[PDB]
């Protein structure tokens, strides 16, 4: 049985868990926005409105049981808009802090946000999810996004909630003509975490990129899935999803690509590299291509394998200890994912989160 009691926290708690970054930070607590702890958005270059107004929301691209429930159970909608050609100096940052309650009761929080990017705007937005403590929670999140002509998006989602939390999230990407969209998701937290990313290319000559890294530990299950529809032609899509599973953890990957008829010149590729480190670990991947146009080139490739024990032996024999050795190859493995983080400062804090689940720290 689940209940939803929305408590309140202090600024001190925020600093100890907040990332070190100069941004426009909006804070949401137990599904509720807390103004006093958030930065103002007026004059930031970001138009922000919080209400229960749903007049604008697009219909869902792929309906499934948990989405209707969340939209319906969502306590508020975040209206965000960026006017034509505007390029904010600072990234928009949404940090999500969820907490559990004493007892056998399960605290639950649902976040709902919508972003509108007018023609030509290019901005970076980051989602950070963390647990205040060890108390369990059920986190819900939903991002619908409209990307107008010539716009460029850099979206990052960081689910760093505790090992005992449950994580179910859903972001949407809608692209217009001449659009560019880049998405990097780091699913690093929760007993069970499930992220789905659905995208629609409703405009010609567009570019899309979606990457993600999953690192499940002891008894946790992290399933990262994506859904992409190439409804129009002349679009190029690239996807890189990597997972690393240690000690009895479980990764699940799902990637559907649909290419509509007449959607000529589409170029979509998908790659999934999985690394197994525990003797009880599992990885399940199910890629799915649906192509209804011949003059196109779509392909996907996925690999699964273990750490090269010989380099590890090679590395250690010169003196590097087991924990640091194991750790060194993994940062190199995820390097291609971590390098897209243009901000060194942000990257190092992200690296710190990765390292703690390694056999170090």
């Amino acid at each position: 049985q689940f209940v939803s009691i929305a408590g309140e926290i202090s600024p001190q708690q925020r600093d100890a868990l907040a990332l070190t970054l100069d941004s426009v930070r909006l804070v949401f607590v137990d599904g509720r926005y807390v103004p006093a702890l958030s930065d103002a958005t007026e004059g930031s270059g970001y138009e922000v409105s919080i209400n229960d107004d749903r007049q604008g929301l697009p219909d869902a691209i792929q309906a499934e049981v948990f989405l209707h429930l969340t939209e319906s159970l969502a306590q508020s909608v975040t209206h965000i808009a960026v006017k034509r050609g505007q390029r904010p100096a600072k990234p928009l940052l949404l940090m999500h802090i969820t907490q559990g309650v004493a007892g056998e009761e399960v605290n639950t929080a649902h976040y709902r946000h919508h972003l509108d990017l007018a023609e030509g705007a290019e901005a970076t937005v980051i989602e950070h999810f963390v647990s205040l403590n060890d108390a369990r929670h059920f986190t819900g999140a939903r991002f619908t996004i409209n990307v107008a002509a010539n716009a460029h998006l850099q979206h990052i989602k960081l689910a760093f909630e505790n090992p005992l939390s449950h994580h179910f999230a859903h972001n949407d990407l809608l692209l217009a003509e001449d659009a560019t969209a880049f998405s990097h998701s780091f699913l690093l937290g929760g007993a069970v975490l499930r992220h789905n990313t659905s995208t629609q290319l409703n405009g010609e000559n567009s570019t899309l990129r979606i990457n993600s890294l999953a690192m499940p530990v002891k008894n946790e299950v992290c399933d990262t899935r994506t859904w992409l529809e190439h409804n129009k032609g002349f679009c190029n899509s690239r996807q890189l999803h990597k997972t690393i599973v240690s000690d009895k953890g479980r990764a699940v990957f799902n990637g559907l690509i649909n290419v509509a008829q007449h959607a000529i010149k589409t170029d979509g590729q998908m790659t999934n590299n999985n690394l197994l480190m525990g003797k009880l670990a599992e990885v399940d991947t199910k890629p799915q291509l649906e192509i209804y146009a011949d003059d196109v080139k779509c392909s996907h490739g996925a690999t699964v394998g273990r750490i090269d024990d010989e380099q590890i032996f090679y590395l250690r024999s010169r003196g590097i200890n087991q924990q640091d050795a194991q750790q060194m190859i993994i940062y190199a493995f995820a390097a291609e994912l971590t390098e897209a983080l243009r901000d060194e400062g942000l990257k190092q804090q992200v690296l710190a989160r990765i390292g703690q689940r390694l056999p170090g720290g």
């Binding site: 024999s317 010169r318 003196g319 060194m328 190859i329 940062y331 190199a332």
Partner: protein, 235 residues
């Protein structure tokens, strides 16, 4: 400095070594020869720490400690170094991040400390210079894109930086030539301070003309049945 006694080792229950015994004192260079399959490749690996080695007999003690019970990471700190016959490529890891951590580790385990980055580059270049190495080693991925001769020569640069006490060369002469042979020699000899030691497990003998050994031992189906000095002949 090194004492291996009545060593018996089997792998997948394979009886390989005949009961080999050897004594190495500080500041000495010893040369090891013999045919393939008599344990040469196994000896270095056994010394190095491969977990797939079932020890069916004997002991190996170093400075009064049982060496066979100590882990690989522990061996470098104490002063043991092995030049691999086939250096591994590690894509995505620069030499700089690797070596500094490795250096610190053995520095840590030896309980002294520590170089200064600023100092380290003046040291690297100088060593990078001794072996005519590419100025972009630090930025390159460990041995990636390197030829066999370059990968082998990289290990010698490695030796001077990690500063071991006992250097073991595991068939590192295979596939090389006189020119490359000339660079490795300047590196190894340069580590000779009359205290430091070297063990050369030869793939073949031509190598001994630039790095004169003081002692030579011959293996035959895993045992030394004859020992002597530099002066040696074939048939």
């Amino acid at each position: 400095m090194l004492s291996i006694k009545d060593l018996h080792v089997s792998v997948e229950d394979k009886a390989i070594l005949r009961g080999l015994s050897l004594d190495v004192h500080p500041g000495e260079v010893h040369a090891i020869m013999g045919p393939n399959g008599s344990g040469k490749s196994t000896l270095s690996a056994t010394l190095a720490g491969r977990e797939d080695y079932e020890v069916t007999g004997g002991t190996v003690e170093f400075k009064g400690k049982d060496l066979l019970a100590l882990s690989p990471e522990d061996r470098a700190g104490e002063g043991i170094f092995m030049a691999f016959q086939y250096p591994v490529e590690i894509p995505g890891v620069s030499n700089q991040f690797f070596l500094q951590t490795a250096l610190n580790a053995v520095r840590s385990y030896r309980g002294q400390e520590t170089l200064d980055r600023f100092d380290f580059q003046d040291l690297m270049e100088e060593k990078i210079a001794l072996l005519k190495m590419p100025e972009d080693l630090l930025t390159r991925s460990v041995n990636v894109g390197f030829s066999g001769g370059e990968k082998k020569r990289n290990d010698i640069l490695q030796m001077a930086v990690l500063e071991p006490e006992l250097c073991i060369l595991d068939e590192s002469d295979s596939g090389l030539d006189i020119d490359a042979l000339k660079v490795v020699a300047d590196g190894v000899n340069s580590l000779r301070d009359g205290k430091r030691s070297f063990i050369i497990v030869t793939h073949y003998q031509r190598i001994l003309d630039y790095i004169k050994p003081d002692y030579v031992h011959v293996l035959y189906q895993g045992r030394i049945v004859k020992s002597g000095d530099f002066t040696l002949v074939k048939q």
